[PDB]
Design an enzyme around this catalytic site. Structure first.
Site, short mmCIF file in Angstrom:
data_model
loop_
_atom_site.label_atom_id
_atom_site.label_comp_id
_atom_site.label_asym_id
_atom_site.label_seq_id
_atom_site.Cartn_x
_atom_site.Cartn_y
_atom_site.Cartn_z
N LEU A 16 -1.48 9.02 -5.43
CA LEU A 16 -1.10 7.66 -5.39
C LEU A 16 -2.43 6.88 -5.54
O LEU A 16 -2.02 5.75 -5.86
CB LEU A 16 -0.85 7.65 -3.97
CG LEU A 16 0.62 7.87 -3.48
CD1 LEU A 16 0.98 7.80 -2.04
CD2 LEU A 16 1.88 7.49 -4.35
N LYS A 38 -5.16 11.49 3.11
CA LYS A 38 -6.25 11.11 2.42
C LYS A 38 -7.37 12.16 2.22
O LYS A 38 -7.72 12.70 3.24
CB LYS A 38 -6.90 9.88 3.19
CG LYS A 38 -5.93 8.46 3.07
CD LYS A 38 -6.37 7.58 4.15
CE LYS A 38 -5.52 6.37 4.26
NZ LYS A 38 -6.40 5.41 4.98
N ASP A 129 -11.13 -7.00 7.45
CA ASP A 129 -10.54 -7.01 5.95
C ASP A 129 -9.09 -7.05 6.03
O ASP A 129 -8.48 -6.40 4.98
CB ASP A 129 -11.30 -5.44 5.38
CG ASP A 129 -11.45 -5.49 3.93
OD1 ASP A 129 -10.96 -6.64 3.31
OD2 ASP A 129 -11.48 -4.55 3.17
#
Ligand SMILES: Nc1ncnc2c1cnn2CC1CCNCC1
Length: 263
Positions: A16, A38, A129
């Site tokens: 991805l 991840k 963020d």
């Protein structure tokens, strides 16, 4: 940690994304549960630095924060989280789906992200963020806050001046970013401050400049944006306040709302 799982139980299926951090895959956990996985490249980054996103994710649990499921702590590292089927909110707004989103779905999405951040507020964390690229979308328009790689327990177009200039990151600088996020939603994901480079943005915002009301966006929603952009950080509203306002929007604030071409 009881977060630890065996490597056999993870099947990495479809890639991805890439990066300097590593890469992200869709996969299966225990041959039953769909998951996002991840990867760290053992060479490029610190093991302790990559594991910090997971360290913070262990303490935080809420239905509008992307949920950790499991870790593999030894090199090569893996971080397993819930799978968000529709990618980032930015890709969602800019893509095929964006065409059909109108104000009621966009403000609901805003309300959900506000709820996640209200939890982060209550726990005395800062995200640092917050922006549409770091929100993930699931089935049925569910939006969840993601990516706590920077999030501590005390990108200039999204960053409040006091943060960008003096390093003063707080939940109130997150509220500024949330204001910027409201424009991403209402412009279908267009980059904020169109036609302005970064050096020009710092200058302008310090001198009092703020984005104008986006086309077809009610002025009451622009006014919420301007509250999130008050120069004085302590005069910016809380995420608890924003959640409630957005939740109640179409009854309390804009009861006469009518659908238009884009919003
Ligand atoms: N939990 C997830 N579910 C689905 N896709 C995911 C994640 C976490 N990361 N990603 C990859 C996206 C892919 C689109 N750009 C932002 C990151």
């Amino acid at each position: 940690d009881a977060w630890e799982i065996p490597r056999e139980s993870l099947r990495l299926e479809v890639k991805l994304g890439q990066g300097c951090f590593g890469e992200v895959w869709m996969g299966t956990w225990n041959g039953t549960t769909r998951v996002a996985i991840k990867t760290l490249k053992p060479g490029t980054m610190s093991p302790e630095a990559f594991l910090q996103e997971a360290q913070v994710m262990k303490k935080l649990r809420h239905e509008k924060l992307v949920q950790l499921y499991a870790v593999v702590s030894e090199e090569p590292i893996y971080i397993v989280t819930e799978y968000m089927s529709k990618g980032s909110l930015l890709d969602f707004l800019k893509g095929e789906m964006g065409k059909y989103l109108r104000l009621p779905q966009l403000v609901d999405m805003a309300a959900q992200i506000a709820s996640g951040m209200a939890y982060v507020e209550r726990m005395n964390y800062v995200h640092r963020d917050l922006r549409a690229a770091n929100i993930l979308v699931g089935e049925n328009l569910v939006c969840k806050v993601a990516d706590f790689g920077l999030a501590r327990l005390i990108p200039i177009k999204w960053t409040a001046p006091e943060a960008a200039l003096y390093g003063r990151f707080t939940i109130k600088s997150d509220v500024w970013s949330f204001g910027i996020l409201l424009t991403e939603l209402t412009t279908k994901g267009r980059v904020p401050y169109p036609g302005m480079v970064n050096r020009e943005v710092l200058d302008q915002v310090e001198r009092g400049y703020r984005m104008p009301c986006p086309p077809e966006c009610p002025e009451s929603l622009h006014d919420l944006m301007c509250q999130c952009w008050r120069k004085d950080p302590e005069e910016r509203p809380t995420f608890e306040y924003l959640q409630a306002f957005l939740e109640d929007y179409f009854t309390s604030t804009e009861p006469q709302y009518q659908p238009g071409e884009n919003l």
